[PDB]
C-alpha cells in the first residue's frame, strides 16, 4: 500500500534525475553539427537480380558471410538457400511448421536456423556427411511465438520470442544458457554487435534494451518511439543502432550518449517500418515500409536519397551483404529483389 | 577452368532437381486452403474441431483439403502474430451467444479484425456455438439482455429470419439480435471485398464442415467474380 506508493515516487524521482542528466549533456543536435557536410546526392539503385521460387509471402532472409549465398524463409513452409550470383538455389529445406517468422545463416555457413509460431527454433545442418540437410536440434524453451534468431557461434545461437524474453542457447546441450527478461511487451527483433559480446533488442513497447551476453542483465534502456518497434539494426562501428517502428519513423540511438540522434521521418509517410539495415560504411540506412516500397536515408543529414520500388506487396525483410556490395529486399509478393 | 565449369554444371543440375521438387510442392500447396480458427476461452472452438504454439488440423470434404488451425500457444496480445494470416481463405471466428457479459468483447474483437489493414480482404465465417444454452437461459429468464444492450428493448425480429418451427419467439429474437449486431458491425465498413457468414451452432451439430465448405466456395467464387470485373 504505502510502501508501493513510496517506491513508485522514488522511481519517478530517479527517472526525473535520469532525464535531467540526459538533457544536461545534450549540447547540440547532430542536425546542427552536420551543417558543414555536403549532401550525398541521389542514389539510383536498380533491380540487378529477381529471385522467384517462393509460393507465399517472404517474411525473413539473411545474407551469408561470403556475400554470395543467402537464405530466405517463406510462410508456405519453405526455407530456400540461394546463390545470389547465378540466381540458382542450392538447397530447399521444407520446414515442419509453415508459419515461420525468422531465419538465420551461421557465420561459418555450416548450419541454418529458423523458427516461427511453433515456439521452437529449428536448426538444420547443411554440410552433412550424407549430403542431405537434416534437423540437428530443436530448441523448445520459449512460450510464445519466436520472432528472431541470430547465430553467435556454431553452438551459441541467441533467440527472441514474442513473450517478453530473449534466450541465449547452447545447441550442443539444447538448453538455455542464459535468459534475458525485462521487456514489457512482445519482443520483435534483435541485433548483435560486431564483437558479439553484447546485443540490442527491440520490443512492442516503444523501447529498446542493450543486453550483455555474458552478464545476462539489462544494461541500458532507450525509449524514444511512440509505437511498436518492428526492426532494429547496428551501425557498422557498433557504438550506435537504428530502430524502425510502426508509427512511421526511424530513430538513431547511441549507447554512449544515451540519446536519439536522428528522427528519420517525413510528413508524407504514415506507414510503419518493417525492416531496417545499414550500409557497409554506415552512410545509407535502408528501411522498408508498409507503403509497398523501400526508402534510403542519409545516416547523417536525415534527408531521403533514393527510393526502391517494384514490390507488389509490403516489404518485410531487408539485408545488406557483409562486403556492402548488394542489398536484398523481400516482400509479401513472394519475390526477392537484389539491388546494387 | 574445367573444374569451375563442372561446378556450374553440378549447380545447375541441383537447381533443376530442386525446381522439379518445388513444382511438385507448388501443385500440392495451391490445392489446399488455410483457415485461421480463433475465439475465446469460453467460445468452445475446440468442440468444432472434429479431427506447442499452433494446434493444427487437416480435414477433407468433397476431395477438397481444408487446413484449419487453432492458436493457443501465445498470449492474449495478438496484434503482431495475426498479420501472418493475411493470406488465408477465411477467418473462422467462434463465439458463444450465451454469456452476454462476454459478448461486447467479442464484438470489439470482430470489429478490430474487420477493420484491419492486412485482414481487410479476408472474409469471416462467424460461428455461434452455444445456441442451446442461450435458449435455456432465455427460457429461464433470470438474465435480461437489455441490461447489457439497451437497444434490444426496441428490436423486432427481421422478416427474413427463418426460425426453426417449434422454438420460442423470444429465443428467436435474441438469436437474431446477436446475429444482427455482428452483421451491422460487419457491413458498417465492408466495401464488398470481404464478407461475414454467421451460423447458429450447437455442441452436437454434425454438419459443421459442409457449412465451412459452402462458405469458402462462396468466398472464392465472389473473389473470382470481382477479379474478372464481373460482380
Amino acid at each position: 500500500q504505502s510502501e508501493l506508493d513510496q517506491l513508485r515516487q522514488e522511481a519517478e524521482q530517479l527517472k526525473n534525475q535520469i532525464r535531467d542528466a540526459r538533457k544536461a549533456c545534450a549540447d547540440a543536435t547532430l542536425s546542427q553539427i552536420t551543417n558543414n557536410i555536403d549532401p550525398v546526392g541521389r542514389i539510383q539503385m536498380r533491380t540487378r537480380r529477381t529471385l522467384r521460387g517462393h509460393l507465399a509471402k517472404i517474411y525473413a532472409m539473411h545474407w551469408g558471410t561470403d556475400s554470395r549465398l543467402l537464405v530466405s524463409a517463406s510462410q508456405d513452409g519453405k526455407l530456400i538457400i540461394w546463390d545470389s550470383y547465378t540466381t540458382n538455389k542450392v538447397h530447399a529445406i521444407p520446414l515442419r511448421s509453415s508459419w515461420v517468422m525468422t531465419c538465420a545463416y551461421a557465420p561459418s555457413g555450416n548450419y541454418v536456423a529458423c523458427g516461427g509460431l511453433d515456439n521452437i527454433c529449428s536448426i538444420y545442418n547443411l554440410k552433412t556427411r550424407e549430403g542431405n540437410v537434416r534437423v540437428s536440434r530443436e530448441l523448445a524453451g520459449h512460450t510464445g511465438y519466436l520472432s528472431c534468431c541470430r547465430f553467435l557461434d556454431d553452438n551459441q545461437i541467441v533467440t527472441s520470442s514474442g513473450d517478453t524474453t530473449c534466450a541465449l542457447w547452447d545447441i550442443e546441450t539444447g538448453q538455455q544458457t542464459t535468459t534475458f527478461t525485462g521487456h514489457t511487451g512482445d519482443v520483435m527483433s534483435l541485433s548483435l554487435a560486431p564483437d558479439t559480446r553484447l546485443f540490442v533488442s527491440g520490443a512492442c513497447d516503444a523501447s529498446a534494451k542493450l543486453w550483455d551476453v555474458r552478464e545476462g542483465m539489462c544494461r541500458q534502456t532507450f525509449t524514444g518511439h511512440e509505437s511498436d518497434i518492428n526492426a532494429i539494426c547496428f551501425f557498422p562501428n557498433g557504438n550506435a543502432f537504428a530502430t524502425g517502428s510502426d508509427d512511421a519513423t526511424c530513430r538513431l540511438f547511441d549507447l554512449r550518449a544515451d540519446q536519439e540522434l536522428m528522427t528519420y521521418s517525413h510528413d508524407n509517410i504514415i506507414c510503419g517500418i518493417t525492416s531496417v539495415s545499414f550500409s557497409k560504411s554506415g552512410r545509407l540506412l535502408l528501411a522498408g515500409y508498409d507503403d509497398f516500397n523501400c526508402n534510403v536515408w542519409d545516416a547523417l543529414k536525415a534527408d531521403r536519397a533514393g527510393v526502391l520500388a517494384g514490390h507488389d506487396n509490403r516489404v518485410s525483410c531487408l539485408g545488406v551483404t557483409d562486403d556492402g556490395m548488394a542489398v536484398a529486399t523481400g516482400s509479401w509478393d513472394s519475390f526477392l529483389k537484389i539491388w546494387n | 577452368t574445367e573444374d569451375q565449369r563442372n561446378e556450374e554444371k553440378a549447380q545447375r543440375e541441383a537447381n533443376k532437381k530442386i525446381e522439379k521438387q518445388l513444382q511438385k510442392d507448388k501443385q500440392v500447396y495451391r490445392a489446399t486452403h488455410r483457415l485461421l480458427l480463433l475465439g475465446a476461452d469460453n467460445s468452445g472452438k475446440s468442440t468444432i474441431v472434429k479431427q506447442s504454439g499452433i494446434f493444427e488440423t487437416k480435414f477433407q470434404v468433397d476431395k477438397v483439403n481444408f487446413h484449419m488451425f487453432d492458436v493457443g500457444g501465445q498470449r492474449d496480445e495478438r496484434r503482431k502474430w495475426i498479420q501472418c494470416f493475411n493470406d488465408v481463405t477465411a477467418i473462422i471466428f467462434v463465439v458463444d451467444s450465451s454469456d452476454y457479459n462476454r459478448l461486447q468483447e467479442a464484438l470489439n474483437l470482430f470489429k478490430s479484425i474487420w477493420n484491419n489493414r492486412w485482414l481487410r480482404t479476408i472474409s469471416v465465417i462467424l460461428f455461434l456455438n452455444k445456441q442451446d444454452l442461450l435458449a435455456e437461459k432465455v427460457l429461464a429468464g433470470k438474465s435480461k439482455i437489455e441490461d447489457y444492450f439497451p437497444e434490444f428493448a426496441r428490436y423486432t425480429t427481421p422478416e427474413d429470419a427463418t426460425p426453426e418451427p417449434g422454438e420460442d419467439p423470444r429465443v428467436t429474437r435474441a438469436k437474431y439480435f446477436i446475429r444482427d449486431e455482428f452483421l451491422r458491425i460487419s457491413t458498417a465498413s465492408g466495401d464488398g471485398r470481404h464478407y461475414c457468414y454467421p451460423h447458429f451452432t450447437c455442441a452436437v451439430d454434425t454438419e459443421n464442415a459442409r457449412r465451412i465448405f459452402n462458405d469458402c466456395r462462396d468466398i472464392i467464387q465472389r473473389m473470382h467474380l470481382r477479379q474478372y470485373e464481373l460482380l
Partner: nanobody
Amino acid sequence: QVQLQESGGGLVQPGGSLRLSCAASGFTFSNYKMNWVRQAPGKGLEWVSDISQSGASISYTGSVKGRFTISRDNAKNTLYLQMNSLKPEDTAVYYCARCPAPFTRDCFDVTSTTYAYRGQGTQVTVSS
C-alpha cells in the same frame, strides 16, 4: 516515453457524478484513438467507451450507454469521461488505454492483461 496519467475521484454516493481526466504525453494525441477500460474488483478488464481521432465516431458499451460521456481535447492533449447516475456495479479501477497504431479505424488488443500503452489507473468507488 509514452505515459498516460489518470485523475478521477474517491468515494461517491449512488446516483452521483464524477469526471475522470486522462493526461497523455509522449506521443501525438490527435493521431491516436483513445479508449476507456475498467477492471472491476474480482473481475477482468473490460471495455467501456472509445473516441476516434477527431471525435466524430463516439461509441460506448451497452451497460454504460446513456450515462457516461467521453470527449477528447486535442489542444491540451487530454481525455475526459463524465459519469452520471452511478450504479453500485460501477465501482472499479478505470484505465485510460490508448491505441497501438495510429491512423487505424480499428483499435486492437486493448483489454489485454499486460498492455504497454495503458495508464496506472484510478479507483472509482461507489457505496453508501
